């Protein structure tokens, strides 16, 4: 009755936005960036190797001053390293050993971690007692949570695997806004440089651009064919690059509302686990399941070098805020610094 | 050429590394077991009769078993965390004939998973007493749900427990063959399946898991010594 008319209206609206995206595409990124000179070979070598963990490393995050980093492993430990001298600043033992995410606050005060226990634990590092004490535990999610990202010292955005994201206020504990609209497990997110709107990628082969202040989903991007399990913003906040399980990354643009470029090679068959840009926005780095990272020249899409050296799967990767290192952490209990 | 505070910071890092190596010595000797099963299978009554995590001991060996079941029916994505566990304890409610084919499909999905290409399955065909009652009562057939049962007869290489009817033994070994067909038809050599029949009021399960983890670690050591 009315449901068929509703489905027909949804189909005609999807056809309207498809024709509107088609009308606004006159050329492509490869037809504008054909005349510029390419990057050339990139040889980045391992400077530091940080060996303290007992099991697989699942996520890491650089501190905002580009020196300290936190890394969470499956044996139930966060370790905070000073990466210039490879010292262990802190070793925090967790309540539950299954941790899938990690975050460093942009003040240096807090560290958040969560995992298969549905609970975002927020730890307070600068106490008057010298030890690292659990400041609080946020619990309102219905599934495992995969990524946590700090806005400032008072509010945190969490994406869980029950098709939802949430904006928590740490001072009280209740979530203030719930972002729904996905139809699969949200696997990663990344915030804009202005932290007024963020983007999140799920297992339904779509990424969605959410407004933090209002609370509504703004745009959806469907280009992939499998689960998106890594996402990161381009540094001016007008593009983002997604990594999936069908062995291809791609770069979507927010204002043009569609996909611009696809990074893939026929000798690559395994899925992407981590994606982050560089400080210019010209090196789309990627961590793969075949134990090595690849550096893609992100304007002409040709590859430009690899970063091999891991024995097992690269599960996390990050570029410092001054752009002077790349830390890749993998399932053989090692973090490695490259520049 | 380090300063004074830098030397004290290196001393703090060394004390942290000492504590981490003590925790490694504790962590290497423990055995993780991922528990899985259906809703009516009673995995929780196995765990409570011997809550995600649960630690127990057999003969000063520490088993550490966790039932991740607080999420929904899509187990496809969090199962990558459990690719270094010692075994997977799968539990089947072997007395409900209507919900048994779903259990077989779930076991086929666990066996042929690409992250579990090395992990062995200890398979507990739970609730044997209700199966015995349903076979000896004769109200609900098994041939209505499995048409091959009309041409299955007990093989000579089996040892029935004393005190039970041969029809009960035929039904028991039919269920066991239906799971070991999915076991043997893939992954021959890397991992195997150890089926046990288990009651609800039975209490010898920690010994069975102990013997099976003994065999699993023995086979892993015969593989990793270039010895097989």
């Amino acid at each position, epitope marked *: 009755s009315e449901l068929d008319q509703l489905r027909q209206e949804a189909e005609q609206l999807k056809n309207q936005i498809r024709d509107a995206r088609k009308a606004c595409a006159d050329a492509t990124l490869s037809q504008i960036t054909n005349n510029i000179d390419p990057v050339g070979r990139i040889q980045m070598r391992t400077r530091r190797t940080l060996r303290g963990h007992l099991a697989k490393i699942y996520a890491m995050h650089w501190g905002t001053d580009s*020196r*300290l980093l936190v890394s969470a492993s499956q044996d139930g430990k966060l370790i905070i390293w*000073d990466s210039y001298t490879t*010292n262990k*600043v*802190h070793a925090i033992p967790l309540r539950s050993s299954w941790v899938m995410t990690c975050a460093y606050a942009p003040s*240096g005060n807090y560290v958040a971690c969560g995992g298969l226990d549905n609970i975002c634990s927020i730890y307070n590092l*600068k106490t*008057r*007692e*010298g*030890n690292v004490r659990v400041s609080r535990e946020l619990a309102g999610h219905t599934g495992y949570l995969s990524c946590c990202r700090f806005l400032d010292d008072n509010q945190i955005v969490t994406s869980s695997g029950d098709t939802t994201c949430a904006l928590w206020d740490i001072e009280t504990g209740q979530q203030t806004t719930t972002f729904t609209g996905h139809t699969g497990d949200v696997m990663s997110l990344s915030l804009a440089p202005d932290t007024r709107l963020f983007v999140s990628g799920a297992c339904d082969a779509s990424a969605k651009l959410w407004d933090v202040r209002e609370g509504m989903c703004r745009q959806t991007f469907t280009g992939h064919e499998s689960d998106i399990n890594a996402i990161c913003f381009f540094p001016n906040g007008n593009a983002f690059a997604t990594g999936s399980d069908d062995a291809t990354c791609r770069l979507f643009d927010l204002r043009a509302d569609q996909e611009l470029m696809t990074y893939s090679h026929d000798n690559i068959i395994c899925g992407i686990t981590s994606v982050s840009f560089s400080k210019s926005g010209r090196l789309l780095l990627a961590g793969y399941d075949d134990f090595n990272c690849n550096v893609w020249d992100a304007l002409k899409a040709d590859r430009a070098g690899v970063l091999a050296g891991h024995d097992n799967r690269v599960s996390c990767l990050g570029v410092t805020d001054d752009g002077m290192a790349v830390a890749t952490g993998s399932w053989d209990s090692f973090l490695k610094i490259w520049n | *050429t380090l*300063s*004074a*505070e*830098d030397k*004290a*910071a290196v*001393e*703090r890092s060394k*004390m942290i590394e000492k504590q981490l190596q003590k925790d490694k010595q504790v962590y290497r000797r423990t055995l993780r077991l991922l528990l899985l099963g259906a809703d009516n299978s009673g995995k929780s009554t196995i765990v409570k009769q011997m809550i995600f995590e649960t630690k127990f001991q057999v003969d000063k060996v520490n088993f550490h078993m966790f039932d991740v079941g607080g999420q929904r029916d899509e187990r496809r994505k969090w199962i990558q965390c459990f690719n270094d566990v010692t075994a997977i304890i799968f539990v089947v409610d072997s007395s409900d004939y209507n919900r048994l084919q779903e259990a077989l499909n779930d076991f086929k999905s666990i066996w042929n998973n690409r992250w579990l290409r090395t992990i062995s399955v200890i398979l507990f065909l739970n609730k044997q007493d209700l199966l015995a009652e349903k076979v000896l009562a004769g109200k609900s057939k098994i041939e209505d749900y499995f048409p091959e049962f009309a041409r299955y007869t007990t093989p000579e290489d089996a040892t029935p427990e004393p005190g039970e009817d041969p029809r009960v033994t035929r039904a028991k070994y039919f269920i066991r063959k239906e799971f070991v067909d999915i076991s043997t038809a893939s992954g021959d050599g890397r991992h195997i399946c150890y089926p046990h029949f288990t009651c609800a009021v039975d209490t010898e399960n920690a010994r069975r898991i102990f013997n099976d983890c003994k065999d699993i670690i023995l086979q892993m050591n015969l593989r990793e010594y270039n010895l097989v």
Partner: single-chain antibody
Amino acid sequence: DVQLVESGGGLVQPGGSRKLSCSASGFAFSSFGMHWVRQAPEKGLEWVAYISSGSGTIYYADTVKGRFTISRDDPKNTLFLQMTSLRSEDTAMYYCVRSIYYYGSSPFDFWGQGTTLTVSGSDIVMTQATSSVPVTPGESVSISCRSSKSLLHSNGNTYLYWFLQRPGQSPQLLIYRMSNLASGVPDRFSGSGSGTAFTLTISRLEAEDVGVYYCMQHLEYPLTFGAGTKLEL
């Protein structure tokens, strides 16, 4: 709450022996390096002992090396100084000072309350050429502390600390590493300088800022204090 309290003072005739005990309440004592710092009845501060975390490193001063012995009991939460062969130049008031060392930490942050003990060279001479400045409430004051060796290490840190001791209380960490304020200090205290010249500046000086201001170095042991500048109103 966080506190350290010490006891074991009182009259000792020379050549004798005495043990001082500092019990800690309210912090993780097993992870804090602990210092002992003494003060003469009219002079300024000087350093006497240091024991690390896990007791793997002990340092003494050049005056008391061999006749003082420091140790710690981590399960019972105590710090001991056993003093033998006392001279008449050990009559002092002894303070038990916690300090934690990692990247970005705040050493010397909490000082004890001190016991009164009555008894009947290629180190850095931190000179503090001013000794008493008459101040009015609500005015900017600057206090200068010149080192002899350059305190700027090669990794950029300038290990110089500024302490405040009020009349009748225990000293308090104002500034650590020449610029960073300590946690709990008003934002009107600020430190400046380079290499061998340092300065503290106070804007809108209140009535609760009178006292004596000490500058400690921390580049290499023995940590030598300054003579202290009094702020008489």
